[PDB]
Design a protein around this ligand. Sequence first.
Ligand SMILES: [Fe+3]
Ligand SMILES: [Fe+3]
Ligand SMILES: [Mn+3]
Ligand SMILES: [Mn+3]
Lengths: 306, 306
Amino acid sequence: GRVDVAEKAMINSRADVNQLLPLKYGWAWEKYLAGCNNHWMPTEVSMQADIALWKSRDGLTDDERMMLKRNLGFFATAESLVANNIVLAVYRHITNPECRQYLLRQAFEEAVHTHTFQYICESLGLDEGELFNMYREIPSISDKDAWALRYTQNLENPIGTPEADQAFLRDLVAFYVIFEGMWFYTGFAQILSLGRRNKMVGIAEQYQYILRDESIHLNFGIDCINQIKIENPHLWTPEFQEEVRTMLTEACELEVAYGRDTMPRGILGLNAGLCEEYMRFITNRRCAQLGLEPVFPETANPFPWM
Amino acid sequence: GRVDVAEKAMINSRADVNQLLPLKYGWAWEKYLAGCNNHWMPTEVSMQADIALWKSRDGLTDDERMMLKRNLGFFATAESLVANNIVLAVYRHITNPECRQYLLRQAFEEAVHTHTFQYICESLGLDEGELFNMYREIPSISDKDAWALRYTQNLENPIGTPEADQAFLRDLVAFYVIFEGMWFYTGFAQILSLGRRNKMVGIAEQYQYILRDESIHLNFGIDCINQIKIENPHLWTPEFQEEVRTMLTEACELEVAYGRDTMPRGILGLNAGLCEEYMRFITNRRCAQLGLEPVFPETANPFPWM
Ligand SMILES: [Fe+3]
Ligand SMILES: [Fe+3]
Ligand SMILES: [Mn+3]
Ligand SMILES: [Mn+3]
């Protein structure tokens, strides 16, 4: 009574989920190997330059500091939200050992990312309460997290029905495509912009590591949605496609509101309009990766260096 | 409305579990840092010698091969059982960010350990089905896993009552103290015995890495049980202490049955009696770490080199 590859599935599989071999989803196994080879620790990056620039007076404009605090405050608790969604929602529904294997890698990388913001907070001497509670004090940040949390909560408060599998797909889109593949990429562009100006390079280097992990996290999650679409064609209905297109649209309006609140006035080489262009370009890119009609007109990448 | 350390607790905490700082359980944070610094991959260990010894005729006695297959077959799927218990049971009930931080590390290390047995199975050319389905075909292995699984299932099929928190404590004992801290240690002694005879050294070296992770996994889980005992003194009743002492007793009888079936005749420098002595010594050691009356008389360590 050993497991055959035909018995294994992304969701609602009857095969023994405790048996890794034989592998069916090689693409999932490949991501796990790539994630492991990207081992890094935030304490490996020196913060001396960033600490000096932070404590100094002329080091950063008041707009740059606020942009930095809002970005850090958003990322500090967002990584925990993604990690909790993996554990409490994604892991249960993916009935596949090799995919769960990568989820364990991804979850741990979220702990490294969370570690990165404890290290930044402790290094720069930031207020822990102000930074980690920022996602309940700032409306622009709170609206983004509350919006993504609903798709996590909806799974927990509903047995393999089409509505159930569609609700799980909404969760994968909200966290892999939107949270990690859109909101984080926009926040990455803001911080890396300072790094390109040789400002807060220690924070920027850690963001480069997080972005490398984030690229695999997104790549895996798109593959999951696409792999689930292959095995469950009945789930990718025209109504659900418009649901996902609508989710991307709201998520962009939440980030526009966030970008405006984070950068009232644009800083050197960065503003809310350019971030609106990048978010609009990335969103269209996510639509193409999901086989979705783009929600915006053709938009160039304002940051081709990302 | 920021989080104070007084609001944070091991279980049933009301503090925002999404906010890592301020840290209350430094011991949990310390384990996470130690786990990360133990980064290793099973593919870093060469198997050429082990592959040659395996394919050769005189390389291993028939008793050694069976002992090796049963040990591998047990560990190949046991790591998934521990990982699933972390995600589906332990993570939900531990209402604490720094402890969840380590759980994400531990869960990933379980994926590395599971990776180790895919690598061993693929290297030695073992039957994947025979190895990964062995825990449903061998009664001695099946009885052990089925016994531990009940404590995972009982949590999933019952809201913060004393019975609920005691059932979660039974789960921590079953998987941290018994599964990882007893059954794995006994299985470690069997394989490392071959390594000390310069037999299957590649497998033995990987087991040394797993044992290093396993020591932290056990250390963390004992700390969790002890930390929960501090904050919930009403849970550590005399009846529950005897429940745990009874769990350890059954778990030892399941391993005695496993040891006998795995080693009918003892091999060079190893037999079921010595493994019974080690299990009995380790079990008494676990009792002392939990503030429990030992279940066996004073027993020396047959393997002081472990
Ligand atoms: Fe991520
Ligand atoms: Fe373990
Ligand atoms: Mn992340
Ligand atoms: Mn393990």
